[PDB]
Design a protein around this ligand. Structure first.
Ligand SMILES: OC[C@@H]1O[C@@H](OC[C@@H]2O[C@@H](OC[C@@H]3O[C@@H](OC[C@@H]4O[C@@H](OC[C@@H]5O[C@@H](OC[C@@H]6O[C@@H](O)[C@H](O)[C@H]6O)[C@H](O)[C@H]5O)[C@H](O)[C@H]4O)[C@H](O)[C@H]3O)[C@H](O)[C@H]2O)[C@H](O)[C@H]1O
Ligand SMILES: [Ca+2]
Length: 415
């Protein structure tokens, strides 16, 4: 008799996996029916924004940790503390503390207090390499613990860039990194960030930021260890990685099902190359599962969120379907140690979570518009038409004005 709407996003392999686990939920709870609204990752934010603007909020939905404070102030998210505490067996202490705490808010700051959502996952973004390619080229394998320096990374990438089938044309490249998701590590490992320590001042004009951004663009334009602009336009580098054309490409746990289906070469995980700090860096992603403050069935809505986030049966089904690593720390640890589950160095994912992964800058700000502005006009830098130095000087005041406005919202909306 009960009906819940569950809104979320995913790549095709993720949509299938969560639809399957929702069906499992419905088998376990024959009185609850779940109506699914699913979208591509790229369409999700617009669709969810529209639902919230209309105050037509799905019972259960994915949301961005950077929106937690805004969602609490606007009464979007139900406080689920008591339903979680009263639930049968569920103990959120087996779950990554880093994950759980992103969705706690005590009235003033994130990380403590009442629960306003549950972690979908933690998403450490690792660096993968094509071991088949390395071994066919006679190049010594990357070390699983010691990061390449930037110079060493470029060196090995040049060695991997070649005409393998002998038709006179390059057909294999060292890498082909997407700035949207892989610039952060180079920036962070070079001792820079988009914003300052206090999270109130834009710092993209830092010489260390500029160096990292120029190095990134230079992979394509100067060192030439990527497909050309035209070649990437013909077929994007994610697809070229899948077809075995690239030495290096990032790997998230959400990728594993798709990679199981499409990747026919051997690959493994390594630390990201390290800039001036000598320490590798990358991001640890997360999404929240929240419950509408306006839901007519809070108990069943939280049961669904718990099933996806924390229930050993729901969790086991998601991990088996290769779209995430276990939310339970002990289970993740035994998972990482199981050699029959590839890649071999799965442990790298845990090392990112525990040691050298960071949050996206927008997780600290009231909205992310200031950061979206940086990326909106970035492509001329990436294609070598504008220097990194010239762009960040132009972008910084635009970003700062947006950040200042986000801060003023934090103040006004929280009266
Ligand atoms: O190179 C130029 C570009 O290439 C062409 O576009 C090709 C792109 O490739 C395809 O995308 C491949 C995927 O992209 C990377 O994954 C990035 C995103 O992760 C997935 O979501 C997982 C989810 O996110 C994690 O949380 C991250 C953040 O943390 C919070 O702060 C915030 O809420 C989150 O956003 C969670 O832990 C986890 O559950 C998304 O699906 C994906 O977008 C990986 O390399 C691949 O999976 C795709 O076809 C194109 O985008 C174009 O020409 C040019 O743009
Ligand atoms: Ca060739």
């Amino acid at each position: 008799k009960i009906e819940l709407t569950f809104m979320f996003r995913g790549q095709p392999q993720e949509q299938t996996a969560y639809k399957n686990v929702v069906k499992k939920f419905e088998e376990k709870h024959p009185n609850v029916k779940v109506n699914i609204v699913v979208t591509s990752p790229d369409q999700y934010a617009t669709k969810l924004r529209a639902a919230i603007a209309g105050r037509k909020i799905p019972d259960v939905f994915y949301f961005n940790p950077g929106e937690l404070r805004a969602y609490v102030n606007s009464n979007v998210l139900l406080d689920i503390t008591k339903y979680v505490e009263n639930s049968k067996g569920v103990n959120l202490q087996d779950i990554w503390e880093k994950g759980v705490n992103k969705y706690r808010f005590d009235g003033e700051k994130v990380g403590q207090g009442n629960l306003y959502g549950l972690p979908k996952d933690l998403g450490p973004f690792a660096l993968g390499y094509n071991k088949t390619m390395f071994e066919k080229a006679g190049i010594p394998l990357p070390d699983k613990d010691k990061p390449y320096t930037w110079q060493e990374f470029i060196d090995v990438c040049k060695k991997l860039t070649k005409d393998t089938n002998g038709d006179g044309k390059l057909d294999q490249w060292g890498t082909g990194l997407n700035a949207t998701w892989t610039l952060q590590g180079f920036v962070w490992s070079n001792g820079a960030d988009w914003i300052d320590e206090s999270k109130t001042k834009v710092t993209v004009d830092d010489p260390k930021f500029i160096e990292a951004l120029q190095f990134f663009a230079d992979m394509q334009n100067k060192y030439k260890v990527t497909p050309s602009i035209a070649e990437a336009q013909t077929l994007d580098t994610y697809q070229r990685w899948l077809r075995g054309q690239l030495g290096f490409f990032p790997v998230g746990p959400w990728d594993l099902a798709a990679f199981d289906q499409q990747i026919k070469f051997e690959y493994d995980l390594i630390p990201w190359p390290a800039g001036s700090t000598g320490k590798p860096a990358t991001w640890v992603g997360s999404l929240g599962i929240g419950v509408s403050s306006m839901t007519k069935h809070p108990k069943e809505a939280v049961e669904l969120a718990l099933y996806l986030s924390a229930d050993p049966e729901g969790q086991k089904a998601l991990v088996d379907q290769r779209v995430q690593l276990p939310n339970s720390v002990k289970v993740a640890e035994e998972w990482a140690k199981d050699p029959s589950i590839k890649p071999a160095n799965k442990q790298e994912f845990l090392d990112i979570i525990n040691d050298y992964g960071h949050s996206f800058p927008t997780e600290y700000t009231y909205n992310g518009e200031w950061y979206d502005e940086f990326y909106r006009n970035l492509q001329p830098v990436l294609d070598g038409k504008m220097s990194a130095e010239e762009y960040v000087k132009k972008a910084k005041p635009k970003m700062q004005k947006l950040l200042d406005q986000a801060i003023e919202q934090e103040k006004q909306a929280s009266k």
